[PDB]
């Protein structure tokens, strides 16, 4: 079955809620596993404690870099980077979970949660998941974003893990 993970969001201590996602199996057997093992924190590193450094209202919330906390660090479970899995799935609408990168073959640990249809991203970004529930917690992390993506407060992944 297709995995389901979650994040327990906080906003500077004060907990917000939970956002769970349905990773994809048959579509992305190597990309979903990456995000799974990290959502868990399955190796002494993963998204546990990391944050959303770049949030842009109406577009997306970005996070994943547990290393430098800016948009340079992070790393997959295969050292640091890995090829573009495939581009079979497209940025159809809000909740779409997709891999953040720096061009082709640069997938680390960084990802973004779309909060609108981001079609221009298709082909450029590997889509590998979607928010299951808590898309309300996501739409609440936006009141803390900006034009450039700077967090108006401090949105944290107070916890995360796999339920199925």
């Amino acid at each position: 079955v297709n995995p389901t993970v979650f994040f327990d969001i906080a906003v500077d201590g004060e907990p917000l809620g939970r956002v769970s996602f349905e990773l994809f199996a048959d579509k992305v057997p190597k990309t979903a596993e990456n995000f799974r093992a990290l959502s868990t924190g399955e190796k002494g590193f993963g998204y546990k404690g990391s944050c959303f450094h770049r949030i842009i209202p109406g577009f997306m919330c970005q996070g994943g870099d547990f290393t430098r906390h800016n948009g340079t660090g992070g790393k997959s479970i295969y050292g640091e980077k890995f090829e573009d899995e495939n581009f079979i799935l497209k940025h159809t609408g809000p909740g779409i979970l997709s891999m953040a990168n720096a061009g082709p073959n640069t997938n680390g640990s960084q990802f973004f949660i779309c909060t609108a249809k981001t079609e221009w991203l298709d082909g450029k970004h590997v889509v590998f998941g979607k928010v299951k529930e808590g898309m309300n917690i996501v739409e609440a992390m936006e009141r803390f974003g900006s034009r450039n993506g700077k967090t108006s407060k401090k949105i944290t992944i107070a916890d995360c893990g796999q339920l199925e």
Partner: peptide, 6 residues
């Protein structure tokens, strides 16, 4: 620097 643009 990593990240999608608007």
């Amino acid at each position: 620097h990593v990240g999608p643009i608007a």
